[PDB]
Structures are given as C-alpha cells and as structure tokens.
Amino acid sequence: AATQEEIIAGLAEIIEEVTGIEPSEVTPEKSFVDDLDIDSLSMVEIAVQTEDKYGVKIPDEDLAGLRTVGDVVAYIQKLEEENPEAAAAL
Amino acid sequence: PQGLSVSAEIDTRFTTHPTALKLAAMLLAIVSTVIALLALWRLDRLDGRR
Numbered sequence: 001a002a003t004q005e006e007i008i009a010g011l012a013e014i015i016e017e018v019t020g021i022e023p024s025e026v027t028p029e030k031s032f033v034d035d036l037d038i039d040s041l042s043m044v045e046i047a048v049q050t051e052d053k054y055g056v057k058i059p060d061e062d063l064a065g066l067r068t069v070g071d072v073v074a075y076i077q078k079l080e081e082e083n084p085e086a087a088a089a090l
Numbered sequence: 091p092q093g094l095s096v097s098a099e100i101d102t103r104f105t106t107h108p109t110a111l112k113l114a115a116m117l118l119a120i121v122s123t124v125i126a127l128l129a130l131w132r133l134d135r136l137d138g139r140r
Contacts, residue, residue, distance in 0.1 A: 044139070060139055 002080060004028070007073045011046075014053075018045050028070045040064075055087075 012023035019042055032038050038046075043066075047058045056076075066072050080086050108116070 057138075 002076065004073050004077075007076055008069065010054075011069070011072060014046055014049050018042055018049065026069060028073060029068065031068055032066065 008026060008028065009023075012026040015021050015026060015036075015038070016023055019036075019038055021036055021038075025036060030036050032043065033040075040063075043063060047063055050056055050058065058075075062075070066075065
C-alpha cells in the first residue's frame with residue numbers, strides 16, 4: 001500500500017507543474033477551490049497528467065467528488081487496496 | 091469613309107468566374123474537411139470525458 005506522505009508528494013509535484021503552487025502548501029486539509037485557488041479546468045489537467053505518469057484513469061464521474069486532499073488520498077488508497085492488480089512497474 | 095477602322099482590345103484578365111468543375115471542386119474540399127474533423131473528434135472522445 002502507498003503511504004500518505006508519498007501520495008501527497010506525488011500529487012504536489014503535479015500541482016506545482018500545472019499551476020505553480022509550492023509543495024509546502026499541499027496539506028491534507030486544503031480544499032481545491034477555496035484555499036488553493038485551483039479551478040476545475042486545472043483539475044482536468046491534473047487528472048490527465050496523473051494518467052500520463054502512473055496509469056490511473058480518474059473518470060469525471062468521480063472527479064467532482066474530490067473536495068480536499070484527504071479525499072484524494074482516500075480514493076487512491078481504496079482503489080489500490082481493492083484491486084490487487086496494481087502493476088507499479090515504473 | 092470605307093476601310094477606315096480602329097480596333098483595340100481591352101485587357102480584361104481579372105474579370106473571370108469559375109466553371110462547374112471549379113465549383114464542384116470547391117464545394118468538395120469543405121465537406122470532406124469537416125468530415126475529417128468530426129472523425130478526429132470522435133477518435134479524441136475515446137478518453138471518456140464530456
């Protein structure tokens with residue numbers, strides 16, 4: 001199972017490439033639109049660059065239900081613990 | 091008098107209009123273009139985002 005401090009560390013390096021927010025602001029209690037001003041037209045880009053590095057297809061059915069970083073870490077944790085087919089081969 | 095004549099010839103070389111072939115070939119380079127664009131859009135829509 002992926003640790004929380006590496007999930008956040010992998011999400012911050014994408015948020016910093018897309019928007020430019022320093023990775024010292026990405027904490028598990030920050031909202032994606034109020035605290036960190038990240039419109040959803042940037043959440044789409046984050047979800048694209050996520051799949052373009054680690055094969056992970058986050059459908060827009062679920063891309064709306066992510067309001068905080070804790071939601072992201074919980075979603076990734078549950079999907080990786082449910083499916084044992086996580087390749088993780090680079 | 092008879093025989094007197096002055097016959098010029100104007101240079102109207104920019105006053106043209108296309109034929110049926112040049113029109114059928116102009117109204118067929120715009121339909122296939124939008125058809126190809128629609129096909130490329132349908133191919134792009136594979137990622138499941140609307």
